[PDB]
Amino acid sequence: STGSATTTPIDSLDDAYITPVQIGTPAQTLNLDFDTGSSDLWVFSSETTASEVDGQTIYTPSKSTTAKLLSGATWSISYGDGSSSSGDVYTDTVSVGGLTVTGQAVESAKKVSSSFTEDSTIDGLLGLAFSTLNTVSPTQQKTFFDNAKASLDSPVFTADLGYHAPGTYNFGFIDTTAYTGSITYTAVSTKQGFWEWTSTGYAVGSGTFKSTSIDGIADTGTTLLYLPATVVSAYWAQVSGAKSSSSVGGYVFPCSATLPSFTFGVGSARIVIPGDYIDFGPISTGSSSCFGGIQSSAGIGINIFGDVALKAAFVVFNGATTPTLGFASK
């Protein structure tokens, strides 16, 4: 089997991407944030505290003929941005882009933090990291990908995120029309439950490539590119008037600037992030200070190849017995 679903930016900055997901019988379609940095499929629901729901579409298990309470199971998750959610668990039928899993754990939120409530466009998350990170207790649950894997034509999914445009998540096949050149594969460590890999270095604009190992995760659920402070300083030093602002919480730059590109290495291959991808617009409405898309990972404890980096590539998440990542230009 295979599946193919379009993923759509939630706003004009590509702050996140939403993908429609069918849950239950008859189908209830929710728009979920597919997150390769976590392993829980959780949704706004009929159980979510009413004051914490503000425009999201909810899953109502009582209206699904295939929903079953997973008796005694609870979940609770905290993300890198300080957000959180928790609740109880149902199993149900879940379909993505025509690919169906029966008996998927659907984590129903009883509580969500303010950042979730305030984002009316995201109805929940669909985790695509390794199932060792799943938070369900006392019986840990499998991701949608892990449950689908054995049925798929090939044990893979691909992320093809757009810049200010829709893109695609495919399951079970690699669309050879969706990228240019060849795919370069690179090793993955699953020791922290992430799609963790080592980039071979970077360049700023037209500058020379610096060969240096940068360990980090491929994380579709993180907006920005978070790298070591040395790398990030080298980037922003090429932008007149850019500075790190402790008041704003990262590097800002004059909105009048033209930003340089940023290249990262994948083995001997190179992915180029155009400068425009690094502009996250005014820090507050009407400001002439703009927020940068490349930020320091210092204090986060891991480097994160988030959407700024991934949207410049066609990315293969290869879930074979020994997982690997693939990157191609597009």
mmCIF file with all atom_site columns, C-alpha atoms in Angstrom, residues 130-249:
data_model
loop_
_atom_site.group_PDB
_atom_site.id
_atom_site.type_symbol
_atom_site.label_atom_id
_atom_site.label_alt_id
_atom_site.label_comp_id
_atom_site.label_asym_id
_atom_site.label_entity_id
_atom_site.label_seq_id
_atom_site.pdbx_PDB_ins_code
_atom_site.Cartn_x
_atom_site.Cartn_y
_atom_site.Cartn_z
_atom_site.occupancy
_atom_site.B_iso_or_equiv
_atom_site.pdbx_formal_charge
_atom_site.auth_seq_id
_atom_site.auth_comp_id
_atom_site.auth_asym_id
_atom_site.auth_atom_id
_atom_site.pdbx_PDB_model_num
ATOM 1   C CA . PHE A 1 130 ? 10.501 6.521  16.687  1.00 0.00 ? 130 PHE A CA 1
ATOM 2   C CA . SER A 1 131 ? 7.826  4.816  18.818  1.00 0.00 ? 131 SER A CA 1
ATOM 3   C CA . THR A 1 132 ? 10.276 4.615  21.775  1.00 0.00 ? 132 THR A CA 1
ATOM 4   C CA . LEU A 1 133 ? 9.302  8.303  22.440  1.00 0.00 ? 133 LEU A CA 1
ATOM 5   C CA . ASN A 1 134 ? 5.543  7.657  22.602  1.00 0.00 ? 134 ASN A CA 1
ATOM 6   C CA . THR A 1 135 ? 4.202  8.857  25.960  1.00 0.00 ? 135 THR A CA 1
ATOM 7   C CA . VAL A 1 136 ? 1.222  6.488  26.443  1.00 0.00 ? 136 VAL A CA 1
ATOM 8   C CA . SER A 1 137 ? 1.259  4.740  29.846  1.00 0.00 ? 137 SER A CA 1
ATOM 9   C CA . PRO A 1 138 ? 1.224  2.019  30.985  1.00 0.00 ? 138 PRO A CA 1
ATOM 10  C CA . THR A 1 139 ? 1.375  0.425  27.498  1.00 0.00 ? 139 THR A CA 1
ATOM 11  C CA . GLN A 1 140 ? 3.463  2.477  25.032  1.00 0.00 ? 140 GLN A CA 1
ATOM 12  C CA . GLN A 1 141 ? 1.814  2.844  21.592  1.00 0.00 ? 141 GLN A CA 1
ATOM 13  C CA . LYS A 1 142 ? 3.125  2.797  18.007  1.00 0.00 ? 142 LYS A CA 1
ATOM 14  C CA . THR A 1 143 ? 3.197  5.675  15.579  1.00 0.00 ? 143 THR A CA 1
ATOM 15  C CA . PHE A 1 144 ? 1.014  5.723  12.475  1.00 0.00 ? 144 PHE A CA 1
ATOM 16  C CA . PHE A 1 145 ? 4.159  4.983  10.408  1.00 0.00 ? 145 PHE A CA 1
ATOM 17  C CA . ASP A 1 146 ? 5.249  2.090  12.598  1.00 0.00 ? 146 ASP A CA 1
ATOM 18  C CA . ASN A 1 147 ? 1.711  0.541  12.369  1.00 0.00 ? 147 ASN A CA 1
ATOM 19  C CA . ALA A 1 148 ? 1.588  1.089  8.556   1.00 0.00 ? 148 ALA A CA 1
ATOM 20  C CA . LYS A 1 149 ? 5.150  -0.031 7.826   1.00 0.00 ? 149 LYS A CA 1
ATOM 21  C CA . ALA A 1 150 ? 4.685  -3.756 7.196   1.00 0.00 ? 150 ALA A CA 1
ATOM 22  C CA . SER A 1 151 ? 1.802  -3.002 4.708   1.00 0.00 ? 151 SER A CA 1
ATOM 23  C CA . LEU A 1 152 ? 3.707  -0.343 2.745   1.00 0.00 ? 152 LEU A CA 1
ATOM 24  C CA . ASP A 1 153 ? 5.299  -1.076 -0.649  1.00 0.00 ? 153 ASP A CA 1
ATOM 25  C CA . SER A 1 154 ? 8.613  0.251  0.827   1.00 0.00 ? 154 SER A CA 1
ATOM 26  C CA . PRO A 1 155 ? 9.172  1.061  4.553   1.00 0.00 ? 155 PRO A CA 1
ATOM 27  C CA . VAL A 1 156 ? 9.602  4.830  3.982   1.00 0.00 ? 156 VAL A CA 1
ATOM 28  C CA . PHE A 1 157 ? 7.870  8.148  4.118   1.00 0.00 ? 157 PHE A CA 1
ATOM 29  C CA . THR A 1 158 ? 8.961  11.400 2.443   1.00 0.00 ? 158 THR A CA 1
ATOM 30  C CA . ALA A 1 159 ? 8.575  15.052 3.350   1.00 0.00 ? 159 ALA A CA 1
ATOM 31  C CA . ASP A 1 160 ? 8.410  17.594 0.538   1.00 0.00 ? 160 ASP A CA 1
ATOM 32  C CA . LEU A 1 161 ? 7.568  20.874 2.263   1.00 0.00 ? 161 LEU A CA 1
ATOM 33  C CA . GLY A 1 162 ? 6.841  24.017 0.242   1.00 0.00 ? 162 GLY A CA 1
ATOM 34  C CA . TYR A 1 163 ? 8.201  27.541 0.651   1.00 0.00 ? 163 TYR A CA 1
ATOM 35  C CA . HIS A 1 164 ? 5.114  29.708 1.025   1.00 0.00 ? 164 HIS A CA 1
ATOM 36  C CA . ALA A 1 165 ? 3.215  26.931 -0.826  1.00 0.00 ? 165 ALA A CA 1
ATOM 37  C CA . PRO A 1 166 ? 1.722  23.485 -0.242  1.00 0.00 ? 166 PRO A CA 1
ATOM 38  C CA . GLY A 1 167 ? 3.848  20.338 -0.348  1.00 0.00 ? 167 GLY A CA 1
ATOM 39  C CA . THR A 1 168 ? 3.467  16.586 0.101   1.00 0.00 ? 168 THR A CA 1
ATOM 40  C CA . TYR A 1 169 ? 3.849  13.733 2.563   1.00 0.00 ? 169 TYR A CA 1
ATOM 41  C CA . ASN A 1 170 ? 4.089  10.350 0.855   1.00 0.00 ? 170 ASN A CA 1
ATOM 42  C CA . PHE A 1 171 ? 4.067  6.953  2.559   1.00 0.00 ? 171 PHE A CA 1
ATOM 43  C CA . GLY A 1 172 ? 5.463  3.758  1.045   1.00 0.00 ? 172 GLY A CA 1
ATOM 44  C CA . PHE A 1 173 ? 7.090  5.104  -2.113  1.00 0.00 ? 173 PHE A CA 1
ATOM 45  C CA . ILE A 1 174 ? 9.646  7.643  -3.356  1.00 0.00 ? 174 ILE A CA 1
ATOM 46  C CA . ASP A 1 175 ? 8.231  9.972  -6.092  1.00 0.00 ? 175 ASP A CA 1
ATOM 47  C CA . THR A 1 176 ? 11.193 10.167 -8.509  1.00 0.00 ? 176 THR A CA 1
ATOM 48  C CA . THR A 1 177 ? 9.502  13.201 -10.207 1.00 0.00 ? 177 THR A CA 1
ATOM 49  C CA . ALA A 1 178 ? 9.572  15.296 -7.001  1.00 0.00 ? 178 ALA A CA 1
ATOM 50  C CA . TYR A 1 179 ? 13.349 16.026 -6.830  1.00 0.00 ? 179 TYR A CA 1
ATOM 51  C CA . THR A 1 180 ? 16.320 16.879 -9.047  1.00 0.00 ? 180 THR A CA 1
ATOM 52  C CA . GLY A 1 181 ? 19.588 14.948 -9.262  1.00 0.00 ? 181 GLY A CA 1
ATOM 53  C CA . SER A 1 182 ? 20.111 12.057 -6.861  1.00 0.00 ? 182 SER A CA 1
ATOM 54  C CA . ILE A 1 183 ? 19.133 11.361 -3.219  1.00 0.00 ? 183 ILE A CA 1
ATOM 55  C CA . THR A 1 184 ? 22.101 11.251 -0.812  1.00 0.00 ? 184 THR A CA 1
ATOM 56  C CA . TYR A 1 185 ? 21.516 8.913  2.093   1.00 0.00 ? 185 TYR A CA 1
ATOM 57  C CA . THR A 1 186 ? 23.140 9.382  5.497   1.00 0.00 ? 186 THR A CA 1
ATOM 58  C CA . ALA A 1 187 ? 23.241 7.377  8.726   1.00 0.00 ? 187 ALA A CA 1
ATOM 59  C CA . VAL A 1 188 ? 20.694 7.768  11.505  1.00 0.00 ? 188 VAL A CA 1
ATOM 60  C CA . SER A 1 189 ? 21.075 7.210  15.233  1.00 0.00 ? 189 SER A CA 1
ATOM 61  C CA . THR A 1 190 ? 17.831 6.189  16.932  1.00 0.00 ? 190 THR A CA 1
ATOM 62  C CA . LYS A 1 191 ? 19.404 6.342  20.434  1.00 0.00 ? 191 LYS A CA 1
ATOM 63  C CA . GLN A 1 192 ? 17.393 9.472  21.450  1.00 0.00 ? 192 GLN A CA 1
ATOM 64  C CA . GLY A 1 193 ? 14.243 8.359  19.481  1.00 0.00 ? 193 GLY A CA 1
ATOM 65  C CA . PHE A 1 194 ? 14.789 11.004 16.779  1.00 0.00 ? 194 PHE A CA 1
ATOM 66  C CA . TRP A 1 195 ? 15.798 11.006 13.113  1.00 0.00 ? 195 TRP A CA 1
ATOM 67  C CA . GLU A 1 196 ? 19.289 12.071 14.268  1.00 0.00 ? 196 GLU A CA 1
ATOM 68  C CA . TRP A 1 197 ? 22.045 12.454 11.703  1.00 0.00 ? 197 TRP A CA 1
ATOM 69  C CA . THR A 1 198 ? 25.347 14.311 11.131  1.00 0.00 ? 198 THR A CA 1
ATOM 70  C CA . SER A 1 199 ? 25.668 17.058 8.582   1.00 0.00 ? 199 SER A CA 1
ATOM 71  C CA . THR A 1 200 ? 29.095 17.401 7.005   1.00 0.00 ? 200 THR A CA 1
ATOM 72  C CA . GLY A 1 201 ? 29.304 21.224 7.212   1.00 0.00 ? 201 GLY A CA 1
ATOM 73  C CA . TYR A 1 202 ? 27.991 24.506 5.978   1.00 0.00 ? 202 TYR A CA 1
ATOM 74  C CA . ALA A 1 203 ? 28.567 27.605 3.855   1.00 0.00 ? 203 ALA A CA 1
ATOM 75  C CA . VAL A 1 204 ? 27.168 31.146 4.146   1.00 0.00 ? 204 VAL A CA 1
ATOM 76  C CA . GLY A 1 205 ? 26.098 32.712 0.845   1.00 0.00 ? 205 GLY A CA 1
ATOM 77  C CA . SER A 1 206 ? 28.813 32.377 -1.814  1.00 0.00 ? 206 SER A CA 1
ATOM 78  C CA . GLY A 1 207 ? 31.445 31.655 0.879   1.00 0.00 ? 207 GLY A CA 1
ATOM 79  C CA . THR A 1 208 ? 33.686 28.625 1.098   1.00 0.00 ? 208 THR A CA 1
ATOM 80  C CA . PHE A 1 209 ? 32.277 25.424 2.574   1.00 0.00 ? 209 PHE A CA 1
ATOM 81  C CA . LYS A 1 210 ? 33.386 24.641 6.143   1.00 0.00 ? 210 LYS A CA 1
ATOM 82  C CA . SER A 1 211 ? 33.817 20.882 6.695   1.00 0.00 ? 211 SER A CA 1
ATOM 83  C CA . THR A 1 212 ? 32.613 20.187 10.226  1.00 0.00 ? 212 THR A CA 1
ATOM 84  C CA . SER A 1 213 ? 30.351 17.512 11.780  1.00 0.00 ? 213 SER A CA 1
ATOM 85  C CA . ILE A 1 214 ? 26.992 18.889 13.039  1.00 0.00 ? 214 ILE A CA 1
ATOM 86  C CA . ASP A 1 215 ? 24.826 16.306 14.746  1.00 0.00 ? 215 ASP A CA 1
ATOM 87  C CA . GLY A 1 216 ? 21.115 17.188 14.705  1.00 0.00 ? 216 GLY A CA 1
ATOM 88  C CA . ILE A 1 217 ? 17.585 15.972 14.113  1.00 0.00 ? 217 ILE A CA 1
ATOM 89  C CA . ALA A 1 218 ? 15.317 16.223 11.075  1.00 0.00 ? 218 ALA A CA 1
ATOM 90  C CA . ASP A 1 219 ? 12.212 17.733 12.687  1.00 0.00 ? 219 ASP A CA 1
ATOM 91  C CA . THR A 1 220 ? 9.214  18.754 10.576  1.00 0.00 ? 220 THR A CA 1
ATOM 92  C CA . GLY A 1 221 ? 7.474  19.995 13.725  1.00 0.00 ? 221 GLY A CA 1
ATOM 93  C CA . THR A 1 222 ? 10.057 22.743 14.383  1.00 0.00 ? 222 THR A CA 1
ATOM 94  C CA . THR A 1 223 ? 9.749  25.910 12.288  1.00 0.00 ? 223 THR A CA 1
ATOM 95  C CA . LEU A 1 224 ? 13.349 27.175 12.304  1.00 0.00 ? 224 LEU A CA 1
ATOM 96  C CA . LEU A 1 225 ? 16.926 25.914 11.804  1.00 0.00 ? 225 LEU A CA 1
ATOM 97  C CA . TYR A 1 226 ? 18.746 25.714 15.172  1.00 0.00 ? 226 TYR A CA 1
ATOM 98  C CA . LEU A 1 227 ? 22.556 25.277 14.915  1.00 0.00 ? 227 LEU A CA 1
ATOM 99  C CA . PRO A 1 228 ? 25.609 25.856 17.074  1.00 0.00 ? 228 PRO A CA 1
ATOM 100 C CA . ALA A 1 229 ? 26.267 29.455 18.108  1.00 0.00 ? 229 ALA A CA 1
ATOM 101 C CA . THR A 1 230 ? 29.530 29.542 16.082  1.00 0.00 ? 230 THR A CA 1
ATOM 102 C CA . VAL A 1 231 ? 27.685 28.657 12.848  1.00 0.00 ? 231 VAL A CA 1
ATOM 103 C CA . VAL A 1 232 ? 24.808 31.020 13.531  1.00 0.00 ? 232 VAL A CA 1
ATOM 104 C CA . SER A 1 233 ? 27.138 33.953 14.344  1.00 0.00 ? 233 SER A CA 1
ATOM 105 C CA . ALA A 1 234 ? 29.040 33.317 11.103  1.00 0.00 ? 234 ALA A CA 1
ATOM 106 C CA . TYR A 1 235 ? 25.725 33.512 9.173   1.00 0.00 ? 235 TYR A CA 1
ATOM 107 C CA . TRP A 1 236 ? 24.359 36.710 10.757  1.00 0.00 ? 236 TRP A CA 1
ATOM 108 C CA . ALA A 1 237 ? 27.773 38.480 10.557  1.00 0.00 ? 237 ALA A CA 1
ATOM 109 C CA . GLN A 1 238 ? 27.066 38.644 6.790   1.00 0.00 ? 238 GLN A CA 1
ATOM 110 C CA . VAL A 1 239 ? 23.883 40.719 7.320   1.00 0.00 ? 239 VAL A CA 1
ATOM 111 C CA . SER A 1 240 ? 24.443 44.440 8.076   1.00 0.00 ? 240 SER A CA 1
ATOM 112 C CA . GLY A 1 241 ? 22.767 45.418 11.307  1.00 0.00 ? 241 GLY A CA 1
ATOM 113 C CA . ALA A 1 242 ? 21.839 41.841 12.416  1.00 0.00 ? 242 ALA A CA 1
ATOM 114 C CA . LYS A 1 243 ? 22.179 41.192 16.129  1.00 0.00 ? 243 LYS A CA 1
ATOM 115 C CA . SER A 1 244 ? 21.125 38.727 18.804  1.00 0.00 ? 244 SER A CA 1
ATOM 116 C CA . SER A 1 245 ? 18.356 40.320 20.886  1.00 0.00 ? 245 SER A CA 1
ATOM 117 C CA . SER A 1 246 ? 17.828 38.854 24.395  1.00 0.00 ? 246 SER A CA 1
ATOM 118 C CA . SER A 1 247 ? 14.558 40.910 24.573  1.00 0.00 ? 247 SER A CA 1
ATOM 119 C CA . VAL A 1 248 ? 13.160 39.355 21.352  1.00 0.00 ? 248 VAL A CA 1
ATOM 120 C CA . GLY A 1 249 ? 14.703 35.890 21.956  1.00 0.00 ? 249 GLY A CA 1
#
